[PDB]
Design an enzyme around this catalytic site. Sequence first.
Site, PDB file in Angstrom:
ATOM      1  N   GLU A  74       1.938   4.458   3.591  1.00  0.00           N
ATOM      2  CA  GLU A  74       0.948   3.821   2.737  1.00  0.00           C
ATOM      3  C   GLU A  74       0.830   4.498   1.371  1.00  0.00           C
ATOM      4  OE1 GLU A  74      -0.541   1.026   3.541  1.00  0.00           O
ATOM      5  OE2 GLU A  74      -2.149   0.853   2.088  1.00  0.00           O
ATOM      6  N   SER A  75       0.760   5.825   1.370  1.00  0.00           N
ATOM      7  CA  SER A  75       0.651   6.611   0.142  1.00  0.00           C
ATOM      8  C   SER A  75       1.844   6.425  -0.774  1.00  0.00           C
ATOM      9  CB  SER A  75       0.546   8.103   0.469  1.00  0.00           C
ATOM     10  OG  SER A  75      -0.790   8.464   0.725  1.00  0.00           O
TER      11      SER A  75
END
Lengths: 124, 124
Positions: free
Chosen positions: A46-47
């Site tokens: 996600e990051s």
Amino acid sequence: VPFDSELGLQFTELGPDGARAQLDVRPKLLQLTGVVHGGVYCAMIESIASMAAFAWLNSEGGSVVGVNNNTDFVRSISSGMVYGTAEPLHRGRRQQLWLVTITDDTDRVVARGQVRLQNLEARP
Amino acid sequence: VPFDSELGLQFTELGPDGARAQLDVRPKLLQLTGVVHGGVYCAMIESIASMAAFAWLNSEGGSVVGVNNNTDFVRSISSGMVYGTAEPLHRGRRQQLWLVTITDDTDRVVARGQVRLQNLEARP
Ligand SMILES: [Cl-]
Ligand SMILES: [Cl-]
Ligand SMILES: [Cl-]
Ligand SMILES: [Cl-]
């Protein structure tokens, strides 16, 4: 990024075509059988995708918000460094789709995921 | 579960038909823009589903391993408690599929995801 600090996630590359980041597997990142908690990889994915997406959008501009994260878990490990690279699948006016692949220190894939984001407008 | 301790995840129910757990949104769980890092929800969903799956399998028995986690992000919040519940979609000999829905303190859905697990045999 606060949660990234908890993960130990450190970025090595970031630009419009992608991003790369890495973390050390530590005991606090494990689950009960002593392998990496899948959530760690979801979060890493996600990051890395989100930062790439922001970099691209701002290369009219705006911000990005995640709408879907679809992660496949491939291999269970208990220690060492893991490394993720984001590559673009779709980058358009409304949405972006990014692929992130996480490898271990033997260049084996441990997890791979796709993140779909919405582009949000900026004030003109 | 070590990573659950980092999240602040506390289970309230666990059995063959599901599980429920909750965490307080703290600053360390936020991303760049001051809302919950999507990875946190991914991880929550992974934990609650995997524990439900293990409980059902052992209700020959064995263990479980995640293979896919597909989470949709619905609403951005910055504080307060969030609460997840796992419900079963498929529970068979080889695999399980669990749905986990995360709500905030106004009973609005913040994230919802499905986790696919492999059942692994035990020594007879
Ligand atoms: Cl960088
Ligand atoms: Cl859209
Ligand atoms: Cl309990
Ligand atoms: Cl299978």
